[PDB]
Design a protein around this ligand. Structure first.
Ligand SMILES: C[S@@+](CC[C@H](N)C(=O)[O-])C[C@H]1O[C@@H](n2cnc3c(N)ncnc32)[C@H](O)[C@@H]1O
Ligand SMILES: C[S@@+](CC[C@H](N)C(=O)[O-])C[C@H]1O[C@@H](n2cnc3c(N)ncnc32)[C@H](O)[C@@H]1O
Lengths: 261, 261
């Protein structure tokens, strides 16, 4: 373990602050770490607080992946971070190459397609929900996001932005991929023809499309769109937050996305 | 149509801006207005952008409640705006008295209870979801919100904050009200005993409890809590966002809450 200051550990104090270096980034907490490693994300070294029980399985995973792991005493860990108290566990990872359609095609499970969603808070929460409910990947269209390593997005996603393919794509390219991949594009809308409760019956791999406005997504998607899906509300004149709408849709598909895996 | 100053309509430029008193307020967007008046809120006057068709119906529900409406010019409508830009339909209103437990106890539908939820972003979205999915009301325990009026809770709620009973309360106060009301308390947690899918089966009106932590809600709600509810995920090792968890919870109760309206 290291209790002194620094040693060469200074790297941690470099990749964390509002520095510049992009090649590396910090991923906090055990679960984001576990899922990152599982997704092939390369790590330089994983750390942990000597005042916290280092998760047995992370230690093991890192072991079977040749990932070095060192303990750090409380005082130094407290110096870092704050005031979210503690990460208690974290690692230095090389920022992966941009995700591609190929990363989604080779995986199994529904695909989440966002169109016009720009608020990082929504995108972040959507990343978490998609991962937790068994989505294969996410395709972002018109999100104003240039890179997925955007720290705002990393933080908004609880550090899960690398745990599943998040592809930045143009509208036409996304449509072409979905079309030629054999997936069934489903447009979720408050005034959709089909009840969201009927999604569980669908045996096909689905591409669930969401917008940012109650009129979204772009009507230009209607061409590729196979059907419109609606989430029942008190009245269909209301609407739900896109992240909330995503959660319900994926919730209805949970069995199909578990069967896929 | 009035391009005149002050033209006395300058109320909007003393209520919308951050001034002195917390009484009246300005509500944007066409929808928030409808449900606001459809509850018991009083509007001094509603305005609208000129070069942009006016929503007929707002007039009917403003004529039967004696609420005046006047058109503003797009040069002045945007003289006070930025976006969207196309908020279009707004109007000053009078902040109602603080919500009471009785308000909820008189209305029908499951009750939502948040414990320790402080982030207004979630609380706001949680309001929309509760409203849209037919929740009787929300109890905000330990939210650090001094008043529902708070301009940040309004903006985070799109202006729907006055569409249903939102009660600020202490932990003991809320626990006492749920027992004396006969409602069955359900605590939602990742490692709950009952599945969220089984909620729709319960014939009784429910009180849904959500914490702010993964280790929440406060275990002091346990005695009152007669059951724990868990939403299935790829692995209970993780957890869902509070608003997403709520949406799914109410979604499974949609038939019972449509039954309560
Ligand atoms: C509804 S818009 C934002 C709400 C809108 N601006 C409003 O308040 O009127 C966000 C996204 O959530 C999705 N969504 C909202 N309600 C839905 C519902 N009831 N069923 C299916 N999708 C829904 C839509 O696809 C939309 O693109
Ligand atoms: C775990 S807390 C905090 C969630 C997340 N850490 C966040 O960004 O806020 C989320 C709340 O939603 C409820 N919740 C979360 N995951 C759930 C699940 N899998 N099943 C049922 N309820 C859940 C819990 O009551 C909890 O209080």
């Amino acid at each position: 373990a290291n209790p002194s200051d620094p040693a060469v550990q200074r790297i941690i104090d470099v990749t964390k602050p509002s520095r510049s270096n992009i090649k590396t980034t910090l991923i906090e907490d055990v679960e984001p770490l576990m899922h990152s490693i599982a997704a092939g994300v390369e790590f330089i070294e994983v750390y942990g607080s000597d005042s916290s029980p280092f998760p047995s399985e992370l230690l093991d995973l890192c072991g079977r992946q040749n990932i070095p792991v060192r303990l750090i005493d409380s005082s130094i860990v407290n110096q870092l971070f704050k005031g979210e108290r503690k990460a208690k566990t974290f690692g230095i990872a090389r920022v992966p190459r941009p995700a591609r359609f190929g990363d989604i095609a080779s995986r199994r499970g529904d695909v989440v397609v966002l169109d016009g969603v720009k608020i990082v808070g929504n995108i972040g929460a959507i990343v978490r929900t998609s991962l937790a409910l068994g989505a294969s990947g996410i395709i972002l269209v018109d999100s104003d996001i240039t890179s997925i390593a955007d720290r705002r997005l990393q933080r908004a996603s609880r550090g899960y932005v690398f745990s599943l393919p998040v592809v930045l794509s143009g509208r036409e390219e996304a449509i072409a991929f979905i079309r030629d991949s054999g997936m069934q594009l489903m447009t979720l809308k408050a005034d959709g023809d089909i009840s969201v409760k009927e999604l569980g019956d669908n045996p096909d791999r689905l591409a669930l499309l969401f917008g940012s406005e109650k009129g979204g997504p772009s009507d230009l998607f209607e061409e590729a769109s196979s059907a419109s899906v609606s989430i029942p509300m008190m009245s269909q004149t209301e609407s739900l937050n896109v992240s909330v709408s995503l959660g319900i849709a994926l919730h209805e598909r949970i069995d199909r996305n578990l069967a896929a895996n």
